[PDB]
Design a protein around this ligand. Sequence first.
Ligand SMILES: CC(=O)N[C@H]1[C@@H](O[C@@H]2[C@H](O)[C@@H](O)[C@H](O)O[C@@H]2CO)O[C@H](CO)[C@@H](O)[C@@H]1O
Ligand SMILES: [Ca+2]
Length: 144
Amino acid sequence: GSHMASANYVNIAENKNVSGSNSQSGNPLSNITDGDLSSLWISDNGAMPANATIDLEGNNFVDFLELHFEKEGFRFQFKVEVEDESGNRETVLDMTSNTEDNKKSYNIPVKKEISKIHATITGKAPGGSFDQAWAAIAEIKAMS
Ligand SMILES: CC(=O)N[C@H]1[C@@H](O[C@@H]2[C@H](O)[C@@H](O)[C@H](O)O[C@@H]2CO)O[C@H](CO)[C@@H](O)[C@@H]1O
Ligand SMILES: [Ca+2]
């Protein structure tokens, strides 16, 4: 880890502010950083593009991000970006032109000092076993 005490990786995203687009009832934005992989954020009425921004309260080194979904199968099209205090922005997982299945979680290597995490579901790919699901994110973790 980059943190003293040594340990391994720390979830510095956990409990941090989450802002973005409308949530449906019982599925608010905070569910993205609550440390529980079963609780979800779901966009109000499946409205897309849907976004979520985790504020890490200033620059922290982050090794890699963890984008967790409800389960495997969903065919969402999603962008994941990062931002520092300086105003620099970098797409770390560009998957907006996705066709076919998404897996349950994604490791997204960063290895940069960042202050913000921009997760954006831009649309839904045709087909799949779950063609009916709404724009949802279970958890985003920031490992440093
Ligand atoms: C039956 C189905 O497609 N379930 C999905 C889907 O649920 C929708 C919504 O989130 C619920 O609040 C509502 O009661 O049912 C909707 C179906 O029209 O999407 C979510 C993820 O976005 C999944 O949890 C369900 O499995
Ligand atoms: Ca959660």
